[PDB]
Nucleic acid binder design. Structure first.
Ligand SMILES: [Zn+2]
Ligand SMILES: [Zn+2]
Ligand SMILES: [Zn+2]
Ligand SMILES: [Zn+2]
Lengths: 1282, 660
RNA sequence: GACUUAAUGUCACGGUACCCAAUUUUCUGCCCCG
RNA sequence: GGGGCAGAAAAUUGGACGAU
């Protein structure tokens, strides 16, 4: 008897199970499951704190297995003394069965002891087994135990209180995934305890013999897996801050609510959560985004007065008061508290209860059928141990899902059934350590290895729980010899947040209730990887899988471990593979001296081969890739990659709307950015790289296939075996195709890679900018002469038929021609695809599979007032009004976006825009594009709108001008209207003319075509490109020879249009056509002096005769709507449009000429491009005219096929009089169209024409009704009034 | 005057779903919608919800539990979870009450029926004492209106089963119309305690069971009733178990294949109780001699009906789709959308029917002798035999060549546990024996048994043995000796030079299409491919031809030109099936697949064999086809188990499967 | 040395929190009378 | 004699086939 003391050290997070002695174990399944785990006991009432220990029976079983395996190697001849086989068998009638029964395969050898073991003399194996002793099955005294195993107690430093289970262990949910569906079937919860601090246990053996000491001591260093973690045994000689943050969040909520801006606090909480990535400097030195320059109020979110003071100052004081708890914790707590208070104020907590699911199945049923199966290896083949060390790198943002940090609490993980849960701030969470470090759990790695081995073998079994006899299939046999280790990185920065939505296939808008965020980790992160195999020979399938996970030059690693694999999240590459070999037959003493290599694997990886410990030798027989039969036959042909580069010739934009509120610039939408971790430099990146999320890729492909095949419109997918449910998966099957991100690869060849583009909504009545209806866009600079190249790949699983490959190729081709744009604002020319290019690395089957002008000749008679008075002396008003009285047509049924209908048609129109008068379109990105502010401070200098150095017209202006023309043409509602004070302006308007709200009452022709807030439009416009002409209208006398200085442009005043409340709103406002820009041209020397250099602007001015080319794409259109759109594009000769700045001065006249129109039809075989000659076009305008006549209410013109006379309908006639150009077809008509200035003795006076507002609106002459009559009637003379 | 939060829509929906005027297929979606409405209402108001909504939720959960059937031998977890949620909701509703009579009666009714279902499914969580107390309290509350709801019928029947006396409610229980015949029989047996009216009523119930599919609760109720009657040492269960077995067979003849795999497999207890019923007659009391043989013939017949029925059920792509559905159903996946009598045996033949009595833990062996026209039976144990078989399988799956000692030990154990295989009276000497084993004896080689003597003798040295998975495989042309070989190693250059074949033998590189197009019905087909049997998913078995073709399903589909043929194949073919057989007695080897397509006899190997043994067998076979396998095995050296275990191990692996 | 094990028998390294979902829909950087 | 607008309206999670 020597009283040896054994101290136990862990190196992996071990598991905890609550203690029940022997009878309460049968009642709770958690205790029955965790028989081989550490046990936790409560000390004191309240379920607050207790103690942890490991039972001596588990250590005894581990030691017994150790001696069994050790004696199996030496044929039961350990250090020269024979050993017998043992018994491992108990008769139930003569004596009581042991508390634990055995199910594994007992290793047995030949009985070479030539004697029978009894109390008098026995082998050391019998002495360790306790086979012949005075004590058994009952504990009375400790003196009779020849061998003993006392309980092991934890060692802890702080002992002011008890262990307080909360900080020692953290609960989590493990899973079981079915092989052929990829979805979970059942889950179970276990407690995991850290090893850095509470990972030491101590106990005593108290052996009362010296014959078996040499075997017991050697067996101690052989046990590796105990309590679910690697180990070695050797002998020895503040919720108050939460309350305060809650009160401050409450006062912030009250202050936000007092300003009727309650809904903004959700975005505020999201921004607070986002600020966790930036350091404390973002709040210390005031780096938060500021408001616009010279504006009274600052930021719409960060400059809201909370209890008088600004939000930034309140946040500063809050951080200064809670500096002790840290920055990350403060930000997370503030965000969570704000979200909870906002939800409580809204009226819901989003309980999210589950019905008929959430199965928690534990392995249960071992009362009988006990067997003892001996396994006797021959006297030949040796047993050797292989250790594999390497590093795992993430080629894509990984994701390891865990439950919310409210159900992860150790002691109260689950109370009872029907327990409604509370959704936290973040729906999807990531796995982190107690030091906030990323972790790859052993369970996920082991499951991935199991699945890969099952695939490599070509056959396998689903894991059976509670089986009486061990599985004898190849996968289980090979997995029983594999030991893995947990991996923890050296990176502790906070994870990113990725947002996802869903789109309704019918209205092509967002789905009601689909908005969530996922936490993802950075790419390029490094994790350790240790594998151990103990067997006779190294399997070829395991080596094939190892080569399959490896990444080298020319081959990419493929280790799909983690979650969200459909969106390409969780692909890993394993590098720096070094395989060493342990000889366990002749070098067992050295394997005992150093306990394998446990806990020092990193050192083994780093050191060279010269300082290798004795006994370990490099393994030089590892096979290459092409020499393995499991590989390249079962593993390599599983996933096939298809990568390509997409060229975008448009300003692609992928908004985030959350990083914009944390970065300087004061911009609403900023393009998406990613952070990638670098290995050589342990920082992230000097500059983030722009990319497009893989979710958009997957959605685009899925919707393309769905609209191709029409399965997107099915109301259900129960028992579905359609194309979409097979290629893309559903809620019961995993997707067969996996998508990755689209990264930008040519960003180093762009200067000012991103462009600033502003936008505005124009009122239909006032003709000016609407109140609080201005915003800006900050996309990437995309141009036809210099496009953006985005490289991305998707993976295809083995087993695809010809039809599915056909579908994928057709979807790729339909992406190529430009039907589905990328990003937002696709209807105005954002993110349009010019073409795709496939490199020479895709599968050969895929590569071989992928490969007269129109004239209207319509003339308009025009007004007679300027025609007869052809010489001079007539002044007209710059703008007139059009009045359509009350009737608006509402279309009850709505053309869906779900499929391409067989009766409707779709296609593209190529149009040419040529100017009649010089054009002005400013590039408002910079305020001084010509550098004239040095001499004259406060002056605004603008250049023409350009991207990457070429002139280009934005598509939003064209869309708006065509929308206004179509709305006036089809007698539809006022899409943009300002309901404010001068009753109010909204009361004057007729109720039927109010803007469309909701789809219940229908959609007017203007809103049904161009689109509304809950129905995406069917017409998409593109950016106009310049080709030819004379540019830069030259004026001698200006510092720049190509610039014009305009006059004062003041806000529109409705008071002149509508007199006192007995009157009625006139309607839309339109501007005339006149060459009035020469008046501004000839008095530059007077306008630059008499006008203060603060109320006028100077811009680059184009010239007449310049041609622009733009295209219009449309889908799912009827015939009459297309005819009406064609007529709106061009109404014939001597009728044009107005577009640009200076319309009142005659500075925006443009003529649109239709060049070609292509119609393509999809319910045909595959597709086809047509030309649609002039006959079909003329038929389409005829159909549109018939539709307009039917809308008129009376059949004035009988049915027939003749050239349509548009001047029969009164409102069409007025509109065409309003857009009639009087100087096109060699006519000497030069009308004068200007404003009265203010009074007499004013600059610009005519001096003798009494054309002043004093004599015009004095109510003495020219009464109110006559004034409105003159304003309504187009082309009515004013100075010689009627 | 209507509450803003009402549950009448769900109550109407459940009421409509209750009556049998709705399609069984459409019953689940509508009740799921009602449950969704109720759960949304509960989520809207967390703890201020009224008791009636809780009652409706519990009712919906009880119905959703009853609309789930116990497939296979393991009950799905969704039924148990639904019952647990329903009982929790009913307890919450009971704890706080608004105060009513009908509401309380309905709440206690739902709680009682949920508790009865929970106890029937498992007795550990809801023991008999708590169920008795709850049900006694419910019957105290006054739910005795037997003419309106059948839940009261169930409460009364379970109350009678549990032990209390209900002599008062008997007349109104019998006068009720909702009760069925089994409940009437239970009431007559547990109240009046008479054996005539109960006999007649449950006899009519059994006669009405011939059309009920094998998914209703009625089968389980009959099984439980007969089990309890057996437990009380009654003299009234033997005949009724016999008739319910007859009804089970009749319904078995009119069921689908996937339903045969899922729902029919849980009637092994019924097929066992009827086996015991017949075995209880033909006993120490002495009736006429002929009734002894008639009873034993009936015992053999019932033991035969539990044999491989899935394989008996076996334009081209429909069969492939059905086979894919079957194989995906074997792994518990989703499946989304003229008989020979037992006496007709050739003269000089003895047939042995094996049946493993699982209820009593015993084994039965029934023997028919044609020359004597006699029937005999004997009993034995199979626990230690199973243990030794598992030990041999585990050792062989890891070493595959040094487990010969375990094979010898297994043969000795078979000889020890079955001493009647060498008795003069049981199996006559110099006779031919046929084996129809059961549920784990297919894997044991019964032609290698050694008697427990000083120097034991093998079973082959005196008897010639043949194998047959079931008696349903027994039934009741050309002379081409076609050959197919894909041995890359060589060592068969002395065999291909024979001119006994022609125009059909693929000497080298034989592939699947060389076997698919065979249409001459050859007299002898020889295949020399590699075996590579599959343990998990035995539906492949991977018969390795050149292109990796016919594994196991192409045999059942792609070959139709081997009817009446004799096929000898050298490869690991007829065994290495999983030790744990299945939820039902089935044999899945490509030898059985070849027997299924129309082949007469198949010679397969129990495990890995050498090239020399196969070459010797194929050379010794074509000399004269009328020689059996026993003489070749005896002359090869199979009697050398004591001195050289490996040669005995190599010699025994061959087995004959064809009954002529 | 209790709380805290039973000794001729502990495969829990027997179980990937897995599957489904386009940050997207509408909008001319435009504009004169107290 | 004089400058306004500089974001507004919604979505902030739903569901997850087991056999008449
Ligand atoms: Zn011993
Ligand atoms: Zn297995
Ligand atoms: Zn589908
Ligand atoms: Zn409208």
């Amino acid at each position: 008897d020597m009283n040896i003391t054994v101290e136990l050290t862990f190196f992996e997070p071990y598991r905890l199970v609550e203690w029940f002695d022997w009878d309460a174990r049968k009642k709770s399944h958690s205790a029955m499951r965790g028989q081989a785990f550490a046990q936790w006991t409560w000390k004191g009432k309240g379920r607050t704190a207790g103690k942890s220990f490991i039972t001596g029976t588990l250590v005894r079983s581990a030691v017994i297995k150790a001696v069994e395996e050790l004696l199996s190697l030496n044929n039961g001849k350990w250090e020269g003394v024979p050993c017998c086989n043992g018994s491992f068998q108990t008769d139930e009638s003569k004596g009581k069965k042991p508390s634990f029964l055995r199910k594994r395969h007992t290793l047995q050898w030949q009985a070479n002891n030539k004697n029978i073991c009894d109390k008098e003399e026995a082998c050391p194996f019998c002495i360790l087994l306790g086979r012949f002793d005075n004590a058994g099955k009952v504990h009375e005294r400790n003196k009779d135990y020849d061998i003993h195993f006392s309980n092991f107690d934890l060692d802890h430093k702080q002992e002011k209180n008890d262990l307080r289970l909360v900080d020692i262990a953290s609960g989590r949910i493990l899973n079981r995934v079915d092989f052929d569906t990829g979805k979970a079937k059942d889950y179970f919860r276990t407690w995991e305890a850290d090893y850095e601090t509470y990972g030491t246990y101590t106990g005593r053996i108290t052996l009362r013999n010296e014959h078996a000491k040499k075997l017991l001591l050697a067996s101690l260093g052989f046990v590796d897996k105990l309590c679910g973690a690697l180990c070695r045994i050797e002998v020895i000689k503040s919720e108050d801050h939460n309350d305060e943050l809650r009160k401050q969040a409450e006062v912030i909520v009250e202050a936000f609510k007092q300003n009727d801006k309650l809904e903004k606090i959700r975005i505020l909480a999201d921004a607070i959560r986002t600020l966790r990535l930036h350091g404390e400097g973002v709040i210390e030195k005031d780096e938060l985004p500021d408001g616009k320059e010279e504006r009274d109020k600052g930021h719409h979110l960060w400059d809201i007065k909370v209890q008088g003071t600004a939000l930034r100052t309140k946040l500063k004081e809050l951080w200064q008061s809670n500096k002790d708890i840290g920055w990350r914790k403060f930000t997370e707590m503030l965000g969570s508290n704000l979200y909870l208070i906002y939800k409580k104020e809204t009226g819901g907590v989003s309980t999210r209860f589950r019905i008929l699911g959430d199965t928690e199945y534990y392995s249960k049923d071992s009362e009988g059928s006990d067997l003892f199966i001996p396994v006797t290896p021959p006297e030949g083949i040796e047993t050797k141990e292989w250790i594999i060390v390497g590093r795992l790198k993430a080629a894509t943002p990984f994701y390891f899902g865990v439950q919310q940090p409210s159900d992860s609490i150790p002691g109260k993980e689950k109370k009872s059934e029907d327990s409604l849960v509370i959704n936290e701030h973040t729906s999807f969470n990531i796995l982190l350590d107690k030091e906030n470090r990323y972790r790859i759990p052993r369970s996920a790695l082991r499951g991935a290895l199991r699945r890969d081995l099952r695939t490599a073998f070509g056959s396998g079994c689903n894991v059976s729980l509670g089986g009486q006899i061990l599985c004898n299939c190849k996968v289980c046999i090979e997995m029983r010899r594999i030991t893995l280790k947990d991996s923890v990185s050296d990176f502790s920065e906070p994870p990113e947040i990725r947002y996802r939505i869903a789109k309704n296939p019918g209205t092509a808008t967002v789905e009601d209730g689909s908005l969530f965020d996922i936490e993802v980790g950075p790419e390029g992160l490094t994790f350790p990887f240790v594998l151990r195999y103990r067997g006779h020979k190294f399997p070829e399938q395991l080596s094939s899988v190892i080569r399959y996970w490896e990444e080298n030059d020319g081959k990419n690693g493929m280790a799909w471990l983690g979650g969200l694999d459909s969106t390409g999240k969780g692909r890993f590459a394993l590098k720096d593979i070094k395989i060493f070999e342990w000889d366990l037959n002749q070098k067992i003493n050295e394997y005992i001296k150093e306990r394998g290599m446990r806990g020092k694997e990193k050192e083994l990886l780093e050191m060279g081969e010269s300082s290798l410990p004795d006994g370990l030798i490099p393994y030089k027989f590892f096979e290459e890739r092409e020499c393995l039969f499991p590989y390249k036959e079962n593993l390599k042909p599983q996933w096939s990659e298809v990568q390509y580069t997409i060229e975008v010739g448009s300003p692609l934009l992928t908004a985030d709307t959350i990083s914009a509120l944390t970065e300087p610039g004061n911009r609403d939408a900023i393009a998406y950015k990613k952070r990638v971790y670098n290995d050589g430099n342990n920082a992230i990146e000097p500059e983030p790289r722009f990319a497009v999320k893989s979710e958009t890729h997957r959605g685009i492909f899925r919707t393309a296939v769905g609209r191709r095949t029409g399965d997107l419109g099915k109301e259900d997918h129960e028992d579905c075996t359609c194309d979409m449910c097979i290629i893309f998966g559903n809620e019961h099957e995993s997707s067969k195709i996996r998508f990755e991100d689209l990264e930008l690869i040519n960003g180093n060849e762009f200067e000012k890679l991103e462009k600033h583009i502003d936008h505005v909504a124009i009122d239909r009545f006032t003709g000016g900018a609407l109140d609080k209806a201005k915003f800006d866009t900050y996309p990437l600079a995309g141009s036809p002469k210099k496009p953006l190249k985005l490289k991305g790949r998707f993976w295809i699983k083995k087993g695809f038929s010809g039809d599915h490959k056909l579908l994928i190729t057709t979807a790729l081709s339909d992406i190529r021609d430009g039907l589905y744009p990328l990003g937002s604002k696709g209807g105005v020319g954002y993110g349009w695809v010019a073409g795709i290019s496939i490199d020479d690395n895709v599968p050969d089957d895929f590569k071989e599979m992928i490969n007269g002008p129109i004239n209207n000749d319509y003339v308009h008679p025009g007004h007679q007032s300027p025609k007869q008075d052809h010489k001079n002396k007539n002044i007209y008003y710059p703008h007139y009004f059009l009045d359509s009285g009350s009737k608006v047509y509402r279309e009850k049924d709505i053309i869906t976006h779900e499929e391409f209908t067989e009766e409707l048609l779709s296609g593209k129109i190529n149009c040419k825009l040529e100017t009649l008068t010089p054009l002005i379109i400013p590039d408002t990105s910079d305020e001084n594009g010509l550098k004239l502010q040095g001499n004259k401070p406060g002056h605004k200098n603008y250049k023409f709108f350009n991207i990457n150095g070429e002139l280009m017209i934005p598509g939003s202006e064209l869309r708006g001008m065509l929308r206004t023309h179509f709305e006036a043409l089809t007698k539809s509602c006022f899409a943009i209207f300002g309901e404010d004070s001068t009753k109010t302006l909204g009361g004057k308007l007729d109720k039927a003319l109010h803007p469309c709200t909701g789809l219940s009452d229908g959609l007017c022709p203007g809103c049904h075509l161009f689109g509304t807030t809950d129905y995406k439009g069917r017409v998409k416009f593109g950016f106009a490109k310049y080709e030819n002409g004379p540019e830069w209208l030259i004026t001698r006398g200006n510092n720049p020879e190509r610039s014009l200085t305009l006059g004062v442009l003041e806000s529109p005043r409705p008071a002149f249009s509508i007199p006192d409340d007995e009157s009625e709103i006139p309607g839309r406002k339109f501007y005339l056509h006149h060459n009035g820009w020469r008046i501004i041209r000839q008095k530059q020397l007077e306008i630059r002096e008499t006008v203060q250099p603060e109320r006028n602007v100077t811009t680059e001015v184009m010239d007449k005769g310049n041609v622009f080319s733009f295209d219009v794409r449309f889908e799912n259109l009827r015939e009459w709507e297309l005819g009406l759109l064609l007529q709106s594009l061009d109404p014939g000769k001597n009728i044009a449009h107005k577009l640009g700045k200076g319309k009142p001065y005659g500075f925006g006249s443009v003529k649109i000429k239709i060049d070609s129109l292509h119609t393509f039809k999809i319910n045909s075989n595959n597709d086809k491009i047509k030309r649609v000659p002039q006959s079909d076009i003329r038929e389409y305008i005829n159909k549109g005219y018939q539709k307009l006549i039917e809308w008129s209410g009376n059949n004035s013109i009988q049915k027939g096929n003749v050239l349509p006379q548009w001047h029969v309908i009164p409102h069409i006639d007025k509109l065409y009089k309003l857009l009639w150009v009087p100087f096109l077809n060699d006519s000497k008509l030069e009308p004068d169209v200007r404003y009265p200035v203010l009074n007499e003795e004013s600059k610009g006076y005519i001096e003798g024409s009494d054309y002043t507002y004093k004599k015009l609106g004095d109510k003495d002459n020219l009464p109110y009704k006559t004034r409105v009559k003159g304003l309504t009637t187009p082309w009515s003379p004013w100075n010689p009034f009627q | 005057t209507r509450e803003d939060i009402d549950r009448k829509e769900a109550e109407r929906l459940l009421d409509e779903a209750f009556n049998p005027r709705t399609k069984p297929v459409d019953r689940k979606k509508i009740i799921n919608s009602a449950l969704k409405i109720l759960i949304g209402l509960y989520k809207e108001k967390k703890d201020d919800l009224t008791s009636a909504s809780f009652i409706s939720i519990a009712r919906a959960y009880y119905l959703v539990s009853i609309t789930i059937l116990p497939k296979g031998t393991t009950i799905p977890e969704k039924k148990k979870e639904a019952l647990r949620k329903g009982i929790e909701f009913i307890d919450r509703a009971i704890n706080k009450f608004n105060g009513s009579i009908l509401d309380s009666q309905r709440a206690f009714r739902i709680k009682s029926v949920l508790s009865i279902e929970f106890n029937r499914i498992d007795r550990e969580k809801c023991d008999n004492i708590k169920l008795k107390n709850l049900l006694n309290e419910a019957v105290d509350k006054g739910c005795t209106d037997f003419d309106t709801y059948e839940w009261d019928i169930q409460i009364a029947i379970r109350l009678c089963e549990l032990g209390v006396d209900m002599e008062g409610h008997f007349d109104n229980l019998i006068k009720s119309n909702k009760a069925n015949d089994l409940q009437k029989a239970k009431a007559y047996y547990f109240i009046k305690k008479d054996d005539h009216k109960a006999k007649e009523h449950m006899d009519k119930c059994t006669a009405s069971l011939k059309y009920t599919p094998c998914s209703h609760r009625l089968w389980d109720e009959t099984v439980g009733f007969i089990e309890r009657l057996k437990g009380d040492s009654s003299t009234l269960w033997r005949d009724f178990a016999i008739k319910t077995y007859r009804s089970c067979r009749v319904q078995e003849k009119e069921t689908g294949t996937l339903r045969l795999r899922w729902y029919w497999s849980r009637h092994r207890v019924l097929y066992d109780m009827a086996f015991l019923a017949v075995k209880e007659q033909a006993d120490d009391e002495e009736p006429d001699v002929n009734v002894k043989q008639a009873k034993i013939k009936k015992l053999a017949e019932i033991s035969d009906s539990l044999k491989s029925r899935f394989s008996l059920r076996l334009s081209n792509h429909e069969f492939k789709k059905f086979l894919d559905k079957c194989v995906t159903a074997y792994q518990d996946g989703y499946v989304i959308n003229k008989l020979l009598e037992l006496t007709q045996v050739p003269e000089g033949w003895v047939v042995v029917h094996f049946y493993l009595n699982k209820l009593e833990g015993m084994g039965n062996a029934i023997v028919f002798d044609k020359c004597a026209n006699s029937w005999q039976y004997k009993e034995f144990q199979y626990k230690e035999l199973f243990e030794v078989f598992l030990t041999w399988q585990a050792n062989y799956n890891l070493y595959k060549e040094n487990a010969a000692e375990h094979l010898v030990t297994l043969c000795k154990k078979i000889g020890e546990t079955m001493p009647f295989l060498f008795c003069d009276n049981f199996i006559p000497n110099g006779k031919d024996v046929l084996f129809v084993p059961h549920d784990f004896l297919h894997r044991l080689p019964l032609h290698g048994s050694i008697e427990n003597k000083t120097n034991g003798k093998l079973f082959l040295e005196n008897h010639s043995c043949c194998y047959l998975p079931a008696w349903s495989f027994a039934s009741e042309t050309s002379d081409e000796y076609v050959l197919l070989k894909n041995f890359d190693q060589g060592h068969f250059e002395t065999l291909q030079n024979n001119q006994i074949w022609g125009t059909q033998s693929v000497k080298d590189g034989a592939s699947s299409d060389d076997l698919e197009n065979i249409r001459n019905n050859p007299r002898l087909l020889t295949i020399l491919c590699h075996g590579e049997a599959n343990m998990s998913n035995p539906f492949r078995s991977m018969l390795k031809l050149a292109n990796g073709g016919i594994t196991y399903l192409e045999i059942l589909n792609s070959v139709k030109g081997l009817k009446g043929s004799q096929v000898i194949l050298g490869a690991c073919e007829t065994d290495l099936v999983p030790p744990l057989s299945d939820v039902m007695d089935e044999h899945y080897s490509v030898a059985t697949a070849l027997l299924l397509i129309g082949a007469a006899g198949v010679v397969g190997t129990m495990w890995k064999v050498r090239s020399n043994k196969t070459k010797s067998l194929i050379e010794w076979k074509l000399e004269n086809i009328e020689y059996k396998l026993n003489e070749w095995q005896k002359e090869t050296g199979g009697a050398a188990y004591k001195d050289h275990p490996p040669t005995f191990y190599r010699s025994i692996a061959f087995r004959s499967i064809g009954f002529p």
